[PDB]
Amino acid sequence: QVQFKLVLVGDGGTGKTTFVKRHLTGEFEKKYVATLGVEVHPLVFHTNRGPIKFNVWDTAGLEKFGGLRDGYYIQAQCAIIMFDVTSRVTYKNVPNWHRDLVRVCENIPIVLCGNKVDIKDRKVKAKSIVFHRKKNLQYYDISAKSNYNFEKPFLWLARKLIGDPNLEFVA
């Protein structure tokens, strides 16, 4: 099997830990306990060309709990930035996380994820998002509570990291 380092960043809340927990166990955490520094978890996906595993570095969004902060980004091979579509202030810090990532890993693939689309009091609309300019960067509406675009940010990553737009993740 092949292994890839993913770093998961974004402001506190937004749902990074619940995202990786839904991918790992199918559980949906309703309560918010902020992470302290990082948590590293393997996620294996099955597909053609054998399985591929992302070891995911769920970082802390609160700077009070940042831990190593930039140190987690070293040797990173892909990144996921995440914001809360119900909290516009989380979307305004997206370029902050983006430059913090690319100042140590500039040409790596990064997926931008608007979480919590299931909440229909949505305050950020997809036409407002413009960070799909470059090719090493992609946007997706996702919801860790609704599984909407569940494992699509990992599909796009995988496709660019191995170099084939056709994997589809067989179960």
């Binding site: 520094g37 590293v40 831990g67 190593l68 140190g71 987690y72």
Partner: peptide
Amino acid sequence: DVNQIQQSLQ
């Protein structure tokens, strides 16, 4: 365990 490693580094 990289989690404990990074904790020790913190």
